[PDB]
Amino acid sequence: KIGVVGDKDSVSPFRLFGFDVQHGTTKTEIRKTIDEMAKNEYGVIYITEQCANLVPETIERYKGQLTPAIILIPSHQGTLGIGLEEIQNSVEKAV
Amino acid sequence: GGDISEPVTQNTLRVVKVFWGLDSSLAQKRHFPSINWIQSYSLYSTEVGRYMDQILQQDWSDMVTEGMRILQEEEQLNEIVRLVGIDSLSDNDRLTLEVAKSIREDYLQQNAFDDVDTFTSREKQFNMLKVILTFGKEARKALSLGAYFNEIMEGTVAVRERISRSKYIPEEELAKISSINEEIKETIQLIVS
Amino acid sequence: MRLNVNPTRMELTRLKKQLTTATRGHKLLKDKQDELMRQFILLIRKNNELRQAIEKETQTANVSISVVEKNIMSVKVPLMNFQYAELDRSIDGFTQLLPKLLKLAEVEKTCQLMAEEIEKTRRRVNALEYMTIPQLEETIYYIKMKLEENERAEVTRLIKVKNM
């Protein structure tokens, strides 16, 4: 069970595979996607970083939960650098 | 002050065989009657058990001892909840905590004000005890097969409401408490597949 | 730093037992903290190199998974099992992302789950060491002093009774 969220051009290639691909653009309905993507047991969700600055709350909420495995990805243009952020504060928070 | 180290309580507990220690903590929670089950003790326990397993012809001696163990375990398992958390570990022990929860809240909590739970006859007193440790092992029956505990807890809630009431059902119709036992034999037949 | 006055005598020795349990707990959670950290640092180094790699590969560029979640005491850990010329190159570069970007999903998720739980455990250790234990020690002392004074305050009175 895999879902992906982002821009159609960059993400519709995932539809070749069995990925319930969305094209969400909203700040709250992106959560609404992810929330219906939460009560169905989709193991992993791929997210273009361009969509993640919209609804940052919802991936901090399920961050402590195993499912869904919320994953930030660059779109066809580029990432916003969510990798530089979250690996940096997470390593220092623990230690 | 509630301190049982006083001369009166001390000299009494030296020439008695039965002691029902009350504590303000349970009376605070309105846990009535507020007898502390961890320390309260009766030296007539073993012999009373013999008399009563003969009279009722049910395995009463084996039931009251293990019913106390689920309570004893409940005490040792909240000692860690403060430290590690609820979902942290010993997941099968959560069932122990939520059936002991029913032990102290559906069986032990005996309000003396209601017109039916003012007095519970020995025969009716049997069914409540019976129903809870059946489930106590019926739970263990599902966690042995692999059915997630959250699923079963929903199965409880559906039938747990009934046993919450089991105090309130009249004496004559004990079959209700006898048949609800059959309903909990049913659920993990319909909830495991 | 005193809690509340609950003067009793057997309560003092039960408090000493509570103290030893707190120290036992503090001890257990301290070397649990280091063992959780032990693997955390291990996985970060896997996390960071997967992430950057992923970025480059993505930028130059029935099939469902079943995830049984394995366990390492506090959190559970996810293990991802898959149970299934420029045009073709884009699809395959994209296809080459698939076995990776999912492995990124593995490592990155385990890390954040560990990392969050470290903080929870770190809070508990800190709260136990700074608040719980010192409040216990200082209380049993003030309790010990009370009955020390009460004992001899009565002994003097008894001598007055004796001298009647």
Swiss-Prot record, chain A:
SUPFAM superfamilies, A to Z: AtpF-like
InterPro entries, sorted: ATPase_V1-cplx_f_g_su, ATPase_V1-cplx_fsu_bac/arc, ATPase_V1_fsu_sf
Biological process annotations from GO: proton motive force-driven plasma membrane ATP synthesis; sodium ion transport
GO MF term list: ATP binding; proton-transporting ATP synthase activity, rotational mechanism; proton-transporting ATPase activity, rotational mechanism
Pfam families: ATP-synt_F
Protein keywords: Ion transport, Sodium, Sodium transport, Transport
Family listed: Belongs to the V-ATPase F subunit family.
Functional summary from the UniProt entry: Involved in ATP-driven sodium extrusion.
HAMAP family for this protein: ATP_synth_F_arch (MF_00312)
Protein name as it appears in the record: V-type sodium ATPase subunit G
Source organism (scientific name): Enterococcus hirae (strain ATCC 9790 / DSM 20160 / JCM 8729 / LMG 6399 / NBRC 3181 / NCIMB 6459 / NCDO 1258 / NCTC 12367 / WDCM 00089 / R)
Swiss-Prot record, chain B:
Domain of life: Bacteria
BP GO terms, sorted: proton motive force-driven plasma membrane ATP synthesis
One of the record's GO cellular component terms: proton-transporting ATP synthase complex
Keywords in alphabetical order: ATP-binding, Ion transport, Nucleotide-binding, Sodium, Sodium transport, Translocase, Transport
One function term, GO molecular function aspect: proton-transporting ATPase activity, rotational mechanism
Triggers of expression: By increasing intracellular Na(+) concentration.
The UniProt record lists the keyword Translocase: yes
Keyword Manganese: no
Reported function: Involved in ATP-driven sodium extrusion.
Family: Belongs to the ATPase alpha/beta chains family.
Protein name: V-type sodium ATPase catalytic subunit A
Organism this protein belongs to: Enterococcus hirae (strain ATCC 9790 / DSM 20160 / JCM 8729 / LMG 6399 / NBRC 3181 / NCIMB 6459 / NCDO 1258 / NCTC 12367 / WDCM 00089 / R)
Full-sequence range covered: 394 to 586 of 593
Swiss-Prot record, chain C:
An example Gene Ontology molecular-function term: proton-transporting ATP synthase activity, rotational mechanism
Keyword list, A-Z: Ion transport, Sodium, Sodium transport, Transport
S-adenosyl-L-methionine among keywords: no
Signal peptide positions on this chain: none
Biological processes, Gene Ontology terms: proton motive force-driven plasma membrane ATP synthesis; sodium ion transport
Pfam families: ATP-synt_D
PANTHER family cross-referenced by the UniProt entry: V-TYPE ATP SYNTHASE SUBUNIT D
Reported function: Involved in ATP-driven sodium extrusion.
Sequence similarity: Belongs to the V-ATPase D subunit family.
Protein name as annotated: V-type sodium ATPase subunit D
Gene that produces this protein: ntpD
